[PDB]
Coordinates of C-alpha atoms and ligand atoms in Angstrom, one line a residue:
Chain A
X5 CA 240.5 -11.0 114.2
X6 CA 241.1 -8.4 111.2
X7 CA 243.9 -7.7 109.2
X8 CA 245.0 -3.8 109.3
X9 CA 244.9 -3.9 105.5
X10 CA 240.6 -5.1 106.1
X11 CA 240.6 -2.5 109.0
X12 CA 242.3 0.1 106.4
X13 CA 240.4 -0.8 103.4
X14 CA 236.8 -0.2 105.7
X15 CA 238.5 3.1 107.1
X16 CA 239.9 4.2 103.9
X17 CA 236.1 3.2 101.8
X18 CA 234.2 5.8 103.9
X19 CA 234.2 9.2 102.5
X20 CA 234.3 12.3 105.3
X21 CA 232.3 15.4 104.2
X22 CA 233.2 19.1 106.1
X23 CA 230.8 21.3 106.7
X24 CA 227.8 18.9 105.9
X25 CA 224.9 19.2 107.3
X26 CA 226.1 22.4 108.7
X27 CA 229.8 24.4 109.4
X28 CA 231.9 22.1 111.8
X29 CA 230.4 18.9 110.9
X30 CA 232.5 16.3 109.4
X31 CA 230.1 13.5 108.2
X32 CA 230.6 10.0 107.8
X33 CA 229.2 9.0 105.0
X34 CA 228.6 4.8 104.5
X35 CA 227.5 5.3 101.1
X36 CA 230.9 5.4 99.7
X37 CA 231.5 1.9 101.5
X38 CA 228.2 0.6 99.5
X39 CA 229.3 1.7 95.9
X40 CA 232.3 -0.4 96.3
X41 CA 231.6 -4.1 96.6
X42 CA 234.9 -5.4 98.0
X43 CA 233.9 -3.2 100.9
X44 CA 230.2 -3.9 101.6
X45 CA 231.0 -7.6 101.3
X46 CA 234.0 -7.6 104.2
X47 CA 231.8 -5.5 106.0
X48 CA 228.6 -8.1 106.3
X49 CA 231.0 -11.0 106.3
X50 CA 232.8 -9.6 109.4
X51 CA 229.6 -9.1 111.0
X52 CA 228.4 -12.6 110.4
X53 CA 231.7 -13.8 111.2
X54 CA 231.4 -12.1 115.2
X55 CA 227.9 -13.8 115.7
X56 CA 228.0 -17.3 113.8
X57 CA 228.1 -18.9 117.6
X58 CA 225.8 -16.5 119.5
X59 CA 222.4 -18.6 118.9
X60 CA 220.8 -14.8 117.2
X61 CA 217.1 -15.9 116.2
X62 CA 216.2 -12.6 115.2
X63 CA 217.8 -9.6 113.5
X64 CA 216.7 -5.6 113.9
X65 CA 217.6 -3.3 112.4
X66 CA 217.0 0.6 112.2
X67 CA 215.5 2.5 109.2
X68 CA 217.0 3.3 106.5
X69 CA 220.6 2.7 106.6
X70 CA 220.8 0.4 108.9
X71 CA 218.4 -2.0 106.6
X72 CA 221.5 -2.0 104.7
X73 CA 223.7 -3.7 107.4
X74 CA 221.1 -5.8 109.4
X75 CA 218.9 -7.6 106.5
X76 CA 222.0 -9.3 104.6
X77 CA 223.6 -10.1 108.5
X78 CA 219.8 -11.6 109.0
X79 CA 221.1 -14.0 105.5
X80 CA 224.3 -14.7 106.4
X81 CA 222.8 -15.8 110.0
X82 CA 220.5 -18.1 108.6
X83 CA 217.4 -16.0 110.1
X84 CA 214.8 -13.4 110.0
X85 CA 215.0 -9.8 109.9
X86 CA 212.5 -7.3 111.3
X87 CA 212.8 -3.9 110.8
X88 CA 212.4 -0.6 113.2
X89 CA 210.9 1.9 111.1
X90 CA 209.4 5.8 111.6
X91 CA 206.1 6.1 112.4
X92 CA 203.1 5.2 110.2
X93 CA 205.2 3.1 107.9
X94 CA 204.5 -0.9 109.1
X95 CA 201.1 -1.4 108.5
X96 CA 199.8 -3.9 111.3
X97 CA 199.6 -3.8 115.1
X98 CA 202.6 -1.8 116.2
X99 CA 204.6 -0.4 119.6
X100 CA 206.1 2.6 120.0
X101 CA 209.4 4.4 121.4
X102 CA 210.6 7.6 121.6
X103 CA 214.0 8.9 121.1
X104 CA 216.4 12.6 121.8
X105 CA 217.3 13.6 118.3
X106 CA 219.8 17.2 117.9
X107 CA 216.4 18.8 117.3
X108 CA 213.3 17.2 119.1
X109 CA 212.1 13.7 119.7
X110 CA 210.9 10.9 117.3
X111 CA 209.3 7.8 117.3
X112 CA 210.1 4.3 116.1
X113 CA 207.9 1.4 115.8
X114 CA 208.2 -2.6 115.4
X115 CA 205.1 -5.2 114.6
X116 CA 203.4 -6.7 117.8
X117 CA 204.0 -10.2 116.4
X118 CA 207.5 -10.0 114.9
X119 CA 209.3 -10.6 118.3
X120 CA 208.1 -13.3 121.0
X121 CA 209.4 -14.6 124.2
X122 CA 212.9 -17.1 123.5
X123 CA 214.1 -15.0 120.5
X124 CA 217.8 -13.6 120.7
X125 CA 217.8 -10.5 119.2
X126 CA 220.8 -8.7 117.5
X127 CA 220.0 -5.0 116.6
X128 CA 222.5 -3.8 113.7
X129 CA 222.7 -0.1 112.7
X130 CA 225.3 1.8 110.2
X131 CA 227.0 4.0 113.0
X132 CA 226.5 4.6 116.6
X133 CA 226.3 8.0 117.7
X134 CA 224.3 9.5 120.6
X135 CA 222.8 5.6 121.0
X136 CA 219.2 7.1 121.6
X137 CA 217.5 5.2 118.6
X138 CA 219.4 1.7 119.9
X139 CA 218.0 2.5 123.4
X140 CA 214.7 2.9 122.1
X141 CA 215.0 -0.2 120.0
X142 CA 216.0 -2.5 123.0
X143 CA 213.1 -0.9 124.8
X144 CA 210.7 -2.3 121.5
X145 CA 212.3 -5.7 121.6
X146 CA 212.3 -6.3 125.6
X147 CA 208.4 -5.1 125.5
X148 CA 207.8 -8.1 123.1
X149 CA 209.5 -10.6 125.2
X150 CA 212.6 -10.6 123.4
X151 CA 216.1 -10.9 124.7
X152 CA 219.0 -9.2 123.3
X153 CA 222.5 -8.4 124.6
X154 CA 223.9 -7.2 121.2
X155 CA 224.1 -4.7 118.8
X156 CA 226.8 -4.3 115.7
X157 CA 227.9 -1.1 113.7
X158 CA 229.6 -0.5 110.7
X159 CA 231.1 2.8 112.4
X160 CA 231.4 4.2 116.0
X161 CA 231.9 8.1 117.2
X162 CA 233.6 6.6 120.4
X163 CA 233.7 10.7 121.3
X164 CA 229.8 10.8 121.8
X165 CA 229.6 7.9 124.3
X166 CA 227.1 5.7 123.2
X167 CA 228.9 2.4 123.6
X168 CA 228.9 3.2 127.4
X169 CA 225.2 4.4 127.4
X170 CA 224.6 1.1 125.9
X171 CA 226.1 -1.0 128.0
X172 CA 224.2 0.5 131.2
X173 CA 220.9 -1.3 129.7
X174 CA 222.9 -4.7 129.2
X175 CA 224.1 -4.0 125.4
X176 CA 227.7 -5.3 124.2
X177 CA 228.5 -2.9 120.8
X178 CA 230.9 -4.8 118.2
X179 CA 231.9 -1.7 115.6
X180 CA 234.3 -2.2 112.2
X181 CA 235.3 1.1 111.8
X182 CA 236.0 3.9 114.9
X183 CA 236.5 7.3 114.4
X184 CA 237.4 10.5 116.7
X185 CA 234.9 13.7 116.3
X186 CA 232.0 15.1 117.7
Chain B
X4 CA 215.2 -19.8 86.0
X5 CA 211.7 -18.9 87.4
X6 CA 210.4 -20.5 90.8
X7 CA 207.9 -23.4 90.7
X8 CA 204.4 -23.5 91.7
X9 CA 205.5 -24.6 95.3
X10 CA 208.1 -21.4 95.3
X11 CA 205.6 -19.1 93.7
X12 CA 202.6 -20.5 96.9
X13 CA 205.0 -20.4 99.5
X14 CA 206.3 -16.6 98.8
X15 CA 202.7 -15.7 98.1
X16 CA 201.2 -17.5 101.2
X17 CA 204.1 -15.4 103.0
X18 CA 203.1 -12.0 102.2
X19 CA 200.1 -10.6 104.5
X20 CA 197.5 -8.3 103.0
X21 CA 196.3 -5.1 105.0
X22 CA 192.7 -3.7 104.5
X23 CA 192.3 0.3 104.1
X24 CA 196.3 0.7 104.4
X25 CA 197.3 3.4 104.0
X26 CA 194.1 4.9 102.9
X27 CA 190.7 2.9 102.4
X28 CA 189.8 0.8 99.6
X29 CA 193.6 -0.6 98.7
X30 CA 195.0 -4.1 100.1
X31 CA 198.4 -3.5 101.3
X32 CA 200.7 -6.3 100.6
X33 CA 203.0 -6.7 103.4
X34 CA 206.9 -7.7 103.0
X35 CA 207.5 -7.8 106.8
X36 CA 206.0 -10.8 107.0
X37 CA 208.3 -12.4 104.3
X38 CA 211.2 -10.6 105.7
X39 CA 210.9 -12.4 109.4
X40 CA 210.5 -15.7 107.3
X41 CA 214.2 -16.6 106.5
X42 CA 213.0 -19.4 104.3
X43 CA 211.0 -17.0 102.1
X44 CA 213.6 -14.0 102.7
X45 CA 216.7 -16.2 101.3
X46 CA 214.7 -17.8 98.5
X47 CA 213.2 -14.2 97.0
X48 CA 217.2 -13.0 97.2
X49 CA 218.4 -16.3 95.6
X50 CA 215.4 -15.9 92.5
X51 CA 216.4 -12.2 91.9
X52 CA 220.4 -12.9 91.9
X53 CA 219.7 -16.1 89.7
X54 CA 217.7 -14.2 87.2
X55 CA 221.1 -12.1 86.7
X56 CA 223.7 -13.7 87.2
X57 CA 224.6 -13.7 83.2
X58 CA 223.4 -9.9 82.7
X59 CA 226.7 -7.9 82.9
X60 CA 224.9 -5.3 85.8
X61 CA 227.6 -3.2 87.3
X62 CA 225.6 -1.3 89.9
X63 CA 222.5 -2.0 91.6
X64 CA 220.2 0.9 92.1
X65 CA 217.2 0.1 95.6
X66 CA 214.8 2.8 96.5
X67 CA 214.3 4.0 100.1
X68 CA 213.8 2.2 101.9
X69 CA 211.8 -1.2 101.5
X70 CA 214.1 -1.2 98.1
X71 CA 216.8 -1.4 100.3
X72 CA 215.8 -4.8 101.6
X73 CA 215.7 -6.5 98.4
X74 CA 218.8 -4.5 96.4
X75 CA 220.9 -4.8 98.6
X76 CA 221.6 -8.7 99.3
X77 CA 220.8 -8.8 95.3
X78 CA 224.2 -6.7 95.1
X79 CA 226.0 -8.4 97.7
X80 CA 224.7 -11.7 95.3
X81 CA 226.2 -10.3 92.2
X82 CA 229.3 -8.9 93.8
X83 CA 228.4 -5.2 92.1
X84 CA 228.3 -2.0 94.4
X85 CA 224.9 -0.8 95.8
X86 CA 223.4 2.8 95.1
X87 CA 220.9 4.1 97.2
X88 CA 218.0 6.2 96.1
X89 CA 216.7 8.3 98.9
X90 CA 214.1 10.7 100.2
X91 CA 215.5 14.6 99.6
X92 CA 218.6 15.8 102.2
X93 CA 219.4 12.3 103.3
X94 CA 222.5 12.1 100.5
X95 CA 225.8 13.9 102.1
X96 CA 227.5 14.8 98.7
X97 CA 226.4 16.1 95.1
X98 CA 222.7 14.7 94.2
X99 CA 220.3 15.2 91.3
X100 CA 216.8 14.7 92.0
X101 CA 213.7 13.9 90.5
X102 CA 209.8 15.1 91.1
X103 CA 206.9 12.5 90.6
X104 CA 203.2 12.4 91.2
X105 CA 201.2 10.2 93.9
X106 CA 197.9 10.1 94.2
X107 CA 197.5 13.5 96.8
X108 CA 200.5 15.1 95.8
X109 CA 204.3 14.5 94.7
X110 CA 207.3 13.0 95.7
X111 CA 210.9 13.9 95.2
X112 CA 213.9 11.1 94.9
X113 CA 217.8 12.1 94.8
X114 CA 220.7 10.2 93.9
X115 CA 224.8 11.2 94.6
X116 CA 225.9 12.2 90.9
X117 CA 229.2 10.1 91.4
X118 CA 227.2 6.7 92.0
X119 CA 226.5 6.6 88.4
X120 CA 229.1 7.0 85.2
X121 CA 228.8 6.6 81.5
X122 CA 228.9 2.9 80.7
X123 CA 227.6 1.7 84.2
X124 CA 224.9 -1.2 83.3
X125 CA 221.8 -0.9 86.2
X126 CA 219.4 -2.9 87.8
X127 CA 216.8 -1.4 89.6
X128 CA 215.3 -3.3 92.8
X129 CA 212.3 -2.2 94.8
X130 CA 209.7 -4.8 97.0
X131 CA 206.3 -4.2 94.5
X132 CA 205.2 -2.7 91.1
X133 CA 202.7 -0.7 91.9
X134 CA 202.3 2.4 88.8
X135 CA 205.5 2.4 88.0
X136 CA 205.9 6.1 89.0
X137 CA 208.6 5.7 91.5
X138 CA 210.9 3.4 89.2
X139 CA 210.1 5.7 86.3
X140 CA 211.8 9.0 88.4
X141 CA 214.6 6.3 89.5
X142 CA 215.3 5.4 85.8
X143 CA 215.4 9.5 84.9
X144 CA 218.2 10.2 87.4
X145 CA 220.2 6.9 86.4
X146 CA 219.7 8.0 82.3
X147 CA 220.8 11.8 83.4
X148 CA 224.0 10.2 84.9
X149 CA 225.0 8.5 81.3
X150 CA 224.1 4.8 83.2
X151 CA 222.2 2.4 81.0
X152 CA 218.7 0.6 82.7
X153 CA 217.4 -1.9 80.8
X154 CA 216.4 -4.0 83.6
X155 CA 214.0 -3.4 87.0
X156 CA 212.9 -6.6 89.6
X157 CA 210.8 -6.7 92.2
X158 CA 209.1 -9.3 95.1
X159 CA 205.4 -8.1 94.0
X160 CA 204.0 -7.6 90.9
X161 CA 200.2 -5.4 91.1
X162 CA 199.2 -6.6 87.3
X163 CA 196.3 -4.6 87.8
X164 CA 198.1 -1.2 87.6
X165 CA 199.8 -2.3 84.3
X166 CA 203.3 -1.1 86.0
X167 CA 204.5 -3.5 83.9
X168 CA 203.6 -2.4 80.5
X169 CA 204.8 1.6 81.3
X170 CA 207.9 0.3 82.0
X171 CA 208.9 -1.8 78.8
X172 CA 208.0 1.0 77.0
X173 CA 211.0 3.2 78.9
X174 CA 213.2 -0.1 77.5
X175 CA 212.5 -1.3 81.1
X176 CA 212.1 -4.9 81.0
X177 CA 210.8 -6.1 84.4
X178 CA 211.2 -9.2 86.4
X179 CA 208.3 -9.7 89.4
X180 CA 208.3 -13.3 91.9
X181 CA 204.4 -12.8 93.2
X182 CA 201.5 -11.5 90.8
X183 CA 198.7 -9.6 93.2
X184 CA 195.1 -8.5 91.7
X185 CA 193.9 -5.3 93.2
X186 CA 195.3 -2.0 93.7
Ligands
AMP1 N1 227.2 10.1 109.9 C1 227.6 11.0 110.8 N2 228.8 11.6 110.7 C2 229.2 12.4 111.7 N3 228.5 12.9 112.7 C3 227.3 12.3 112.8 C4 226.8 11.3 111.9 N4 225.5 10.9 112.3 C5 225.3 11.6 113.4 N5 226.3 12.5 113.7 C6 226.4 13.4 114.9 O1 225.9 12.8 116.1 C7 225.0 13.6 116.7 C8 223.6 13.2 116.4 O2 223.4 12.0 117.2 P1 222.2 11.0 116.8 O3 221.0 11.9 117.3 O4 222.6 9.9 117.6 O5 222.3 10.8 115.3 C9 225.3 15.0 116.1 O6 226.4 15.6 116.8 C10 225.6 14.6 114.7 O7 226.3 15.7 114.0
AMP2 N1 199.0 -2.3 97.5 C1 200.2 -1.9 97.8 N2 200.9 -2.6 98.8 C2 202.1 -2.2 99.2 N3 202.9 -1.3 98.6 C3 202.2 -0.6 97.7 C4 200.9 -0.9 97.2 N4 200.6 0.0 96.2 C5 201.7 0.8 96.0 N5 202.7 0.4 96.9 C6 204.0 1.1 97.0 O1 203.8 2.4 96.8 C7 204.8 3.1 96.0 C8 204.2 3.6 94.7 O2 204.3 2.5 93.7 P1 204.3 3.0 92.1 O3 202.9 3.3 91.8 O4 205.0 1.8 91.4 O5 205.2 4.2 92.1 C9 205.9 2.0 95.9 O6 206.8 2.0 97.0 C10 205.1 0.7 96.0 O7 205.9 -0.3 96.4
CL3 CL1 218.8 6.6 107.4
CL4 CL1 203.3 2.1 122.2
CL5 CL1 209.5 2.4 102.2
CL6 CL1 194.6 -11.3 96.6
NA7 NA1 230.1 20.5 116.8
NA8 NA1 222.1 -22.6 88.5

């Protein structure tokens, strides 16, 4: 549906950082794409735009940066927005998943009551890399009674294989922005 | 302008309240549940936009991370870019930071150093007044970039704390949706 100059204007609004957090990492960094407000606009819009007609009752999405993306695609959907946060943070009854990060495991939690059979969830997230803290997030949603099927990114590493990973537990990833490295 | 009485009750009635979280003796108001609500969600977002609509703001500044809830559609609702402030070694490129007391200890906040230029006007946006320490720090790295703050908002207001009053005399003129008693 969108123009190479949208495509280009997302691509061109994300700043790459060498060496960051470490030698032989080039970062992607969405807060460049923030700061400017033709950008952060066509990026929600899009979003919206892909799911208008999917009957979404719910939107998750990941803490922090992916508050940023899922809570004004919750708005522009005409619904709710729950958040996945680290643990300790939400302060009622909560479940649990863990997750693979480079270095360890972590946990992230959702509120008992925020998900209930016959929702459609859509999970959005800033970038998808490894997939581990979407996995875990389906996992959340699916142990409430929840259904979801979805899950929307602002970029994708298509290199580290998450889209693939996801779709093995039913997920279809919609992404803006791809790009190569690893 | 400001939301009526039946506004003001049903974003109220839609914030739960949390005995002994996160430590005993406070009364945690809850945003989740005024988040899931899409009623109460879209209506705080449309108060806060409304309320600066006429206000020249140029950037809009949200602290990690329930900030990032309420900044963020207010941006997207004025059209201005959104700067994150964020827990230390989150930030890829050149931050400043600032150090700030809690009750058991201190907390550090960082902003990028290019988010912020001389003549940038800045609204601040975080889900509850509580002190005021954590806006105060936020207003100390937006000042130290040249930007001008003359303006914070929130969802919750805790009068009690007299957030309010520390802030106004920083030339910080805050705007709140729902008054809570209590720490
Ligand atoms: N914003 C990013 N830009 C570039 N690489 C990233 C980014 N976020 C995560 N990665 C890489 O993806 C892997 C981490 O996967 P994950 O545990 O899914 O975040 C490591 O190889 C990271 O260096
Ligand atoms: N009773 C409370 N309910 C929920 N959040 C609180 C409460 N008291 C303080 N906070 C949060 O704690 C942090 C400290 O607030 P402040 O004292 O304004 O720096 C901020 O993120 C407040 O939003
Ligand atoms: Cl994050
Ligand atoms: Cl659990
Ligand atoms: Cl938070
Ligand atoms: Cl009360
Ligand atoms: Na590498
Ligand atoms: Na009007």
């Amino acid at each position: 549906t969108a123009t190479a100059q949208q495509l280009e204007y997302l691509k061109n609004s994300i700043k790459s950082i060498q060496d960051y957090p470490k030698p032989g990492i080039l970062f992607r960094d969405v807060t460049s794409l923030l700061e400017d407000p033709k950008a952060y606009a066509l990026s929600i819009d899009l979003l919206v735009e892909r799911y208008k007609n999917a009957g979404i009752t719910k939107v998750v999405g990941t803490e922090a940066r992916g508050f940023l993306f899922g809570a004004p695609v919750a708005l522009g959907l005409g619904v709710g927005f729950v958040p996945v946060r680290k643990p300790g943070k939400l302060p009622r009854e909560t479940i649990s998943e863990t997750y693979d990060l480079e270095y360890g495991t972590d946990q992230l939690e959702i509120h008992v009551d925020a998900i209930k059979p016959g929702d459609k969830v859509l999970v959005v997230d800033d970038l998808l890399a490894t997939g581990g803290t979407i996995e875990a997030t389906v996992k959340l949603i699916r142990r409430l009674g929840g259904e979801v099927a979805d899950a929307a990114f602002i970029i994708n590493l298509f290199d580290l294989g998450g889209e693939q990973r996801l779709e093995k537990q039913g997920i279809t990833s919609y992404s803006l922005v791809p790009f190569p490295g690893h």
